Amino acid sequence: GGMELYLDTADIVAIKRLAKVLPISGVTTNPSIVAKSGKPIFLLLNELQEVLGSDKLLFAQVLSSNADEMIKETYQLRKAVPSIVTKIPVNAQGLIAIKELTQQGIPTLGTAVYGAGQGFLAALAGAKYIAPYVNRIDAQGGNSKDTVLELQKLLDLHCPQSLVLAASFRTPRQALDCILAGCKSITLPVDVAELFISDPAVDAVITKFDQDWCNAFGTLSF
Amino acid sequence: GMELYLDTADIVAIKRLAKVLPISGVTTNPSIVAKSGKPIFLLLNELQEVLGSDKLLFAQVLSSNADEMIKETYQLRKAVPSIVTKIPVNAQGLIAIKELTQQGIPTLGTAVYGAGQGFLAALAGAKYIAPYVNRIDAQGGNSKDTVLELQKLLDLHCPQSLVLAASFRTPRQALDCILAGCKSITLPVDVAELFISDPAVDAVITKFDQDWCNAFGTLSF
Amino acid sequence: GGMELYLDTADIVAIKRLAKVLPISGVTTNPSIVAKSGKPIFLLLNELQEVLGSDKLLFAQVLSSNADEMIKETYQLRKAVPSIVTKIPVNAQGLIAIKELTQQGIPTLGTAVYGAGQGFLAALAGAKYIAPYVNRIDAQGGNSKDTVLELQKLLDLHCPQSLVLAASFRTPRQALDCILAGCKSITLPVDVAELFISDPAVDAVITKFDQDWCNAFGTLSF
Amino acid sequence: GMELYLDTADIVAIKRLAKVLPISGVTTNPSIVAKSGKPIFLLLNELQEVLGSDKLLFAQVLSSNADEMIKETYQLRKAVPSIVTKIPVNAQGLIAIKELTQQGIPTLGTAVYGAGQGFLAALAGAKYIAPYVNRIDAQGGNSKDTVLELQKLLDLHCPQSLVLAASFRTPRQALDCILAGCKSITLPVDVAELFISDPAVDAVITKFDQDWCNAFGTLSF
Amino acid sequence: GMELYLDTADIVAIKRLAKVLPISGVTTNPSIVAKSGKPIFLLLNELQEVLGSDKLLFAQVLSSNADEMIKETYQLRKAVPSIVTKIPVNAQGLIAIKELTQQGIPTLGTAVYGAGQGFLAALAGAKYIAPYVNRIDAQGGNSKDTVLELQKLLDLHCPQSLVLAASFRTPRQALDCILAGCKSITLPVDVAELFISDPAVDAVITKFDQDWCNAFGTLSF
Amino acid sequence: MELYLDTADIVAIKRLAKVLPISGVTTNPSIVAKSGKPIFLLLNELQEVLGSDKLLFAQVLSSNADEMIKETYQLRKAVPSIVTKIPVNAQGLIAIKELTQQGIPTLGTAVYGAGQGFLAALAGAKYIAPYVNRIDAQGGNSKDTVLELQKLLDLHCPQSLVLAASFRTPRQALDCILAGCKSITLPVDVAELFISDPAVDAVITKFDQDWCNAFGTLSF
Amino acid sequence: GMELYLDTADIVAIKRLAKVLPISGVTTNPSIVAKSGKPIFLLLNELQEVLGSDKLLFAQVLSSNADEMIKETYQLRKAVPSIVTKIPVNAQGLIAIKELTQQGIPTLGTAVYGAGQGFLAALAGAKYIAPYVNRIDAQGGNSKDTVLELQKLLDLHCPQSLVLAASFRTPRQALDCILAGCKSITLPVDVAELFISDPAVDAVITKFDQDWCNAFGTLSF
Amino acid sequence: GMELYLDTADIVAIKRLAKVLPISGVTTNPSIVAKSGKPIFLLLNELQEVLGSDKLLFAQVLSSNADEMIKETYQLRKAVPSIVTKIPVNAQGLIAIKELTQQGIPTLGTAVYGAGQGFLAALAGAKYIAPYVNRIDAQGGNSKDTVLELQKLLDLHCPQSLVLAASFRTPRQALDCILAGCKSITLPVDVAELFISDPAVDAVITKFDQDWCNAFGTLSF
Amino acid sequence: GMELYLDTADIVAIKRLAKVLPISGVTTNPSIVAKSGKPIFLLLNELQEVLGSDKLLFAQVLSSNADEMIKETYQLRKAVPSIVTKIPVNAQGLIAIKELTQQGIPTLGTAVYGAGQGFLAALAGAKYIAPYVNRIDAQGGNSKDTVLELQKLLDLHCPQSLVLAASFRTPRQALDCILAGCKSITLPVDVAELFISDPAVDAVITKFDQDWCNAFGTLSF
């Protein structure tokens, strides 16, 4: 029980289109995604809320490398979007920020996770969501499938209050393996999300259905 | 809660197999209805007559546009108020499934060739997800692996949906599906018959009858 | 929990001997077993009840190949032995009979099962017991251990009100693999039943125990 | 090495697929020939000529008696001197195979449903052993396991014999056979065509063609 | 609820090991008693004296006849009212076990060499089942496989019984038994001592002391 | 591969030798007992039915190595190429060593464990016969024991081979040759089960039906 | 739940890492105290001031006699009432653990090189069992195997105890322990820091920041 | 091929077992000789006399210094010129092994508790490597795993060396060593006799004789 | 064959360890050289002196530019004609490796963190590929898996190259590398010592001596 599917993008046009088609729970962003959109972050977040509605969840990342400024940036994000989940890279200063924000009851996501132990520490520090960079692990000679299975196992064994938000994908096989490992949430870029619903075998069997129907009845109606 | 369906529009076969097998109803698709040559609303009433009222029917929308798929769903429901509507899992199909779920209308996401595809239909609200088992094997895939993955996703993440395994040329394909844990399956006539006609069974029954007749003369108590 | 161990014989002498030794729940018969005893089936059912007592369970098989007469034969058997379980071969006519008897609350066993799918259909039809012919599967180039594992798995997944009654054995290894697969009942021929309790290693160690005891104390007594 | 055969008596389909696929010959059985409706010697004449002399033919005896099986083998060898005679692996079949082996006549042991049965035919002298893959699956067995065991027995104990995998409803069945190590296989027409008609292949060729025409105007260098 | 017993009649070693290990009592068998040289009623008296009152004793009948095994059981119970009586799992032993179970008298089915044999004793009502682990290994068997099968049968079918693993020459055998899930075990002296006397432990404790004494002068706070 | 029949039934042997590609016939004292024939009368009967081109096995009776040797001589005198079966225990090992030195082939029989059977191979026995069904009958796992024994011979005894014996099911026999055993001896009931699958008769019946429906004769 | 400890006496390192990591306290052993040069009662006071009242401390007895180990346990409890005392799992160690458990004192059984040895300490009543993971690897063993076996024993038989995995040279060892199910672990400083100092993390964070600044010219919202 | 040795100094047992088992010689160690009460050169003379010349003997050096180990090796070669000298694989033993290999004197690296330790002795020139199988099990290890690792290293990197498996309490340990591929093994008396004393063998022989006697009267031809 | 190297600039340790271990040479890297404080040509002459003439040395280039890497390779060969030059496997190192290969100069591709990266160096001509085993574990990877993959790629595709496994904190890492099939390895001092200093070995040597002295009085023959 419980899957949360997110779109990993800041293209408002694609979000509007894919949110109609896919059963999505919200949108994740990161500094490069926001920069490639060219929109100031507070304007983007307003456009995101308008297109998504009020029942959905937004994620946005801090910029500073010291924990005190990360905490101040979280406050800015919360002021713009009161339910927003703040993404914090899992390093020394991030762990300091995650611990304090947890003490104040502010939800966080531990991001830029390349190893199972690294992400586990962010869960122990209080982050509800842990985001391994699946494709970057594969891009650096690792095995993202193994890393995600280990991370999910550690949360199942030891941190039931946290979950994996698998992120960073170039293929549907990567995404599929993450949710097969048990990840309770995932965020997909536009190109990978579209691939799940554009298999050519599906078109060909529908074409064959319509042809058989027309050859027997003339029109494609009941 | 296993549900066994027959995947056919052959009323003669359905009448016969419904007396033999513990079936919950009948599934159709546009090729099956086309092969019967009957208008679908006549066929649907014929199916209700042979099956009765405790059983469940499945029928497929025709158009590729979500608005007309929904209109076609309403036509089917009007003819058969309990029918489950089959909708291909593609962009327009997912839109239809979400709309119909919003209204409490049960659906089946069909023409599923991959586990992620089928999983998206369940998340959009379809109660049933039907992988095309044999078509996956026919196009160089491994249907056993695909069905295992899809059932695993439903067990992990969508306990309110089930796999309705479909499209079969061998009983081995169908058996592997229910061994994977699929809670529903629809068999074509030829595969259904194969499960219940093993020459080894006839042979041992013949030996039983010979032994009984050798000892007592008549095949009776 | 509840294991049910049956004896698969009509040999009254061997039944009273092995029922004193083994924890048996009753006796299964089939037409060849009854034919070999030479006794009319109602005479035999009388002697079986007398030798076994009132707490045990009996299984007897229909003769007819037509569903209507299988049903009537079931009623004949139930008239003689009100608690008897009727064995019905899992073929087309057999499934018709099982379906009707299930609606009427009459317990049945689906017998002559050579494949997991076949047996599963009898459980879906309502048969409480499913009896694969374990040794006959091995005798016809198959693999009885694989088949019994698939059958038990189907019942655990989908039919928790049915159980496997494993039958037809030439070796204790076959029977042991069945209860290891999780089969909740089993019926043993006399020779296989005796083998489970006549290992020469046990006799040798007891003999060594007695020799050590008499070497030390002179008598085999406390 | 690998010997690929077609399992059919349809002379039109054989001519079409022998142009397309790298086939080594054609196998027949009594039902296959019966379905064509052609007398056996008429059919063998047509098969020899459509295939040419480079290829191999397989045809099955009819009788249940070993001495008549042998005489029927002589009839086939007279018509097609290089033919391989198919003999069902049962008691009389095994007698024929031993006698024909002694006479230096090649045989195939057919109707194999178990690995031990097929192994006995190889020990008797049959060069080819044909498990009925799909019939094993159709009767509650597991053809993948049975073929693996048969192939392992020949690899361990009978290097002069090989499996000719036969009887197919899905390409997955046929692929599992050659992955098991089977050195020869015979496909019915519909399975052979499935191997070469995947719609994803069509889709990527169509896409290549659109990309080329946009860039260069015509589908030419 | 693990129960650890010692398998010995050496009363000096019992009181020593009972101060080190958390033992629940002592198991005997006719050879252990015979080698002790002490009559059993004297031995049983010394065991109660050394162990105290909250511990459990196991002793074995001598006769091969079920009626006399039952008489011997009553003799043991009169000397030690809480004692568990060990009965070999054979035809006469099973008769004895069933009768004593009906009378509410606890038993251990001993001299178990196979999983089926042990399982029958649990069905007959024995609370404890004692495979002879090392004797299985000694006669060309595999005790690890046999114990895993026995524990599996009890987990599946007899929740009220437990394995009391017995007969050991190596700690590896004992460790594999409790890893298999056996809820009780009885160890001979030499195997029990090996669990708690690793040279690596002494070596690391020595190095701890040397470091502490180099820092602070003596081995004290 | 060497396939033998494990029986003394002369009628059954003559029938199955025509059908199966057998190399000969193995006996043991119970098999000879059940026949009721004195062993030399039976062996001459076996050599007449089998012909001069097959191979016989027969077992010593004595428990003492010296008398096992003399019993082997009696066997060789009756059947010069016979392979003598010697139970693998301490006295049996002594006899096998000695017979090997005389150039007399032996089978080490009554093998219940891989180590035991391996020792008879190192002592010179060409054939090693595990009692497959007896291992299963006494709480063992014959498939495990036979895999271990065959592995030992593959690693260390190229001149020796397993002769798998004692069977109640074709499944047992198949698992032995799948394990690599190069010889096997089958009782009559198991041997016939390999060639009497009802599925095979059923498909030939359908073949004949399709052919007769198309052509009107069951002929070419 | 999970308990993460630091295995060190370096006060400067403890206060730095306690701010970063979600630690539950600090474990010490004789060598660790000896390197620090501080008398243990001074170091225990510093450790409380740096950590605060909510954390948990662990410290090891010195003696080899159960009596003196028990004395040293009371000295430690006098200074730190909530402290958990570490006792080597050997003969005299198990005597101390059995006595301290009967008094309701919590203990940790340390210097564990095998699963059986550690299991006996849990049966004696030690709440924590500390295998020396790296020392098992250092002496030709396989620490991953030993930790798996030890944790399986506690899961099967001692639900009131838990493994406190200790002694590490690589983060791979530490990760394997928590993947095995260990509910607690204590890390040396250098392994702890490696978990949070991957060059790939710095590289991707740098790319994010450079992308942002190239577009908007400041690192601010 | 396989080399089977006896690990004893019992001249009575050696003489008895050499007539039954195919043994290649006898190994000793300092404890086996000490337990004999015989001075080593007297014992070595007796072992040659009992075994004859076509056998191989193993004896172990005493000192911890490499120079004295070499001296002790010369004394053994003077006493028994074909003998194989056992050297414990530690720092000094490795120096001794490298020196004796340069001189053409064959050695066995003994007291091997880990695969890496044993491998270095092979690389240093020792023809035989002796893991202490039962001692690895006694100290919380897994002898099966260590021997498999040691054999693998020699197969991959040092095939001119071989494992001489030693130290046994059960035939199962011994059998696993030879199943792992060890080309030599040395057995204590009691384990060696267990391989040829299975009670199942005596029982089936008795049944054979009972069948024979019932049918013929005398247990003869 | 197996090449064992020491990964150090510690002349004293090398002299000591080369006496004990079968050492084929010494590997260095810029940190090891810098830590010794000796300019590289000084250290190389000192290594040649302690190792002698038939041992192999490895040394690493400094520059990030392929042209300058090649010139530095020429300087190293001038100093030590047989030296193997270490080159980091990045874009410029690959350029250097391809050019040095064309000149017949031997190279090692170092700083390998992924199997594909190392494989590219082998294809470019590097004879040795040096994965940084412990650094892979240090950064949240699995060194065991990465080494297995790298070795497999060389076994499948590059028969002229081998893995020189490097960078170790535990003997477990080192043993897993040679078990994976790596044909060369370089050990730091502390790990090399651990292979030959097991406390179990000392303890069994001590028992052998006590047994000998109890029965004979002196520790001599």
Side-chain angles (χ1 to χ4, degrees), chain F residues 21-101:
Chain F
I22 72 163
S23 289
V25 167
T26 64
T27 64
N28 67 40
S30 295
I31 290 179
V32 182
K34 124 262 170 146
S35 87
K37 305 177 187 183
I39 187 176
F40 297 131
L41 171 61
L42 170 60
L43 287 174
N44 286 332
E45 212 153 309
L46 290 177
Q47 265 182 313
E48 187 214 348
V49 172
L50 284 184
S52 63
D53 202 9
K54 294 308 157 67
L55 188 57
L56 283 171
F57 299 72
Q59 186 166 324
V60 299
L61 264 23
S62 178
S63 58
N64 159 270
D66 289 330
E67 192 57 31
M68 289 181 209
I69 302 271
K70 311 192 203 301
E71 292 176 353
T72 303
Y73 296 162
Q74 305 188 265
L75 287 184
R76 308 279 281 170
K77 170 155 62 239
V79 180
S81 66
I82 200 168
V83 172
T84 300
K85 311 175 81 183
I86 294 167
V88 182
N89 51 25
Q91 287 298 298
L93 269 346
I94 301 183
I96 294 170
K97 285 197 188 182
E98 176 59 27
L99 287 176
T100 300
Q101 258 175 60

Side-chain angles (χ1 to χ4, degrees), chain C residues 27 41 45 69 89 93 125 133 138 155 171 173 195 212 222:
Chain C
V27 166
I41 193 177
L45 289 175
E69 187 67 29
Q93 293 295 319
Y133 282 1
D138 286 330
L155 299 197
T171 79
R173 177 84 257 165
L195 289 173
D212 292 356
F222 298 141

